Homo-oligomer: 286 residues x 2
């Protein structure tokens, strides 16, 4: 019975492992050039979850020997003001990557602002250009969460080619890039959303299921195919352990492998961002 | 029983008001809209397609700038030509006819076309913009298919669409356009297992494989909407990527081959050129 239980896809462990390599790379770069890699983080407004995510990302920068430039803008910031701040960061040669923490206050055209980030500094992978390049096999930083997921799958030797992957959710920065990344890895990919009919049946057809709906435990455990690889990209704070977008209680009897929540996708989102920032700094300072 | 999704008729209809628009623009500005067409090398089908596209331009009162480059053209040479066209204020749209000779990095060359002139919808930036709901010219073939479906009042929202093929200029944009129209979308390709199974569940099936009659009639769901984007010339009538002989007994609606998707590929390109000229000149 112990042997037949699902493989835990341990994002926490993998993130720590990647960070050890990032640290030596950053220290080498600092020694050679005298300069520290910088991630600019932009936090617009007062959302508590956003503030926490930015704090965690800054901490990850420092863990690998980098630092962050913390830009904090008021909740009433306009699109025009945010664009101007991004252009300042684009023009600053000391800034290697730019993170705009989503979701910005809703009066701002978030897409316009994402698209203003220069490709070379798009270390969270949010630009339309970056998405298009990735979708067509050209070099670009990938959207952090789905790229982190691909890394988890590859480093745990999960078979993707020829498998049926079902991505539930189609957001610009998660579901859509996830789908394109899985397609590039030769999965057959189905993309579902709030207007999908027969969702339970489509999920049951999936060899690989990605929950990206932002609704706690929406994906039911009885929809999961026996032996499926289960990736839960959600996080919803709860007293006594947060939960994701998938019912994971007892998942170890159903899945061949799964990402826990917490400790699965979350750490790899942060670490992917920081890795792409190290790559951007290595390029800029070389 | 099937509705014939008549691309020829729709193209003709659309060209009527494109001609009105172009004649109004010429009268106002004294300038003729120009599509630059780039034919690289000796492929016969490519030459035919480019001529058809130039003819369509002329039917709606525009003109073409015919660029013909040799089979042995290099990536560098083609990029240089595209950059000349980008900076030529007399050129409003640029078409690079696919597939270019194998030694050329076609994707690099597509991506060199300026967004404002990307009237065939081939750039990575244009694809990404489209996929995220931002304004951009759409890849001509899939955008034409969307127009056919919409003009024929085909229900897309909530339907299970299956796109067989994932090319950068056809299957991938087709998938994203159907997704924006609120279809659930499955994208299949040469590594798909159980393709017949998946096709059988398609409410909307798009054949985008470039292999004659690969998609079998027996795989088609009763009542499906069947879109065949293939064309393979044959004596006494070309065929597409789907077996369509007898399709009228199965499909609720289908695109014939020829006369379905093909005319609408051309029309979409010309429409987007009219749009580009109106923006540049108006
Ligand atoms: O903000 P955020 O973190 O919530 O992300 P978000 O940007 O709201 O994305 C959530 C995604 O999950 C999808 N979704 C929401 N409810 C669903 C449901 N009941 N069934 C299937 N898909 C569903 C949404 O569909 P839509 O794209 O149709 O809204 C959307 O694609
Ligand atoms: O060049 P071109 O004009 O032929 O277009 P292309 O650029 O080769 O596109 C053809 C598309 O059809 C797909 N395809 C080819 N054979 C298939 C098969 N037997 N089953 C499912 N999908 C198939 C290809 O899969 P791949 O993308 O897997 O090659 C590709 O995505
Ligand atoms: Cl707010
Ligand atoms: Cl792909
Ligand atoms: Cl011509
Ligand atoms: Cl004619
Ligand atoms: Cl969409």
């Amino acid at each position: 019975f112990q042997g037949h239980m699902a493989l835990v896809l341990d994002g926490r462990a993998l993130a720590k492992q990647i960070e050890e390599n990032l640290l030596v790379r950053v220290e080498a770069l600092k020694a050679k050039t005298g300069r520290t890699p910088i991630l600019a983080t932009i936090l617009v407004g007062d959302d508590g979850a956003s503030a926490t995510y930015v704090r965690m990302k800054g901490n990850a920068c420092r863990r690998v020997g980098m630092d962050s430039l913390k830009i904090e803008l008021p909740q009433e910031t306009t699109t025009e003001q945010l664009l101007a701040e991004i252009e300042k960061l684009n023009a600053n040669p000391d800034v290697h990557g730019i993170l705009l923490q989503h979701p910005v206050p809703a009066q701002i055209d978030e897409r316009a602002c994402f698209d203003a980030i220069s490709l070379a500094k798009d270390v969270d992978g949010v630009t339309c250009l970056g998405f298009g390049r990735m979708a067509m096999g050209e070099a670009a930083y990938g959207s952090a969460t789905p790229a982190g997921i691909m890394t988890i799958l590859k480093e745990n030797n999960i078979e993707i080619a020829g498998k049926h992957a079902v991505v539930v959710g189609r957001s610009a920065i998660l579901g859509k890039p996830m789908a394109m990344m899985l397609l590039q890895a030769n999965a057959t990919v189905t993309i579902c959303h709030s207007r999908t009919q027969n969702l339970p049946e489509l999920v049951k057809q999936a060899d690989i299921i990605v929950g990206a709906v932002g609704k706690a435990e929406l994906i039911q455990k009885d929809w999961i195919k026996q032996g499926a690889v289960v990736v839960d990209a959600g996080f919803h704070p709860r007293d006594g352990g947060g939960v994701g977008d998938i019912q994971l209680q007892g998942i170890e009897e159903i899945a061949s492998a799964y990402t826990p929540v917490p400790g699965g996708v979350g750490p790899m989102t942060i670490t992917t961002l920081i890795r792409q920032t190290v790559e951007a700094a290595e390029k800029a300072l070389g």
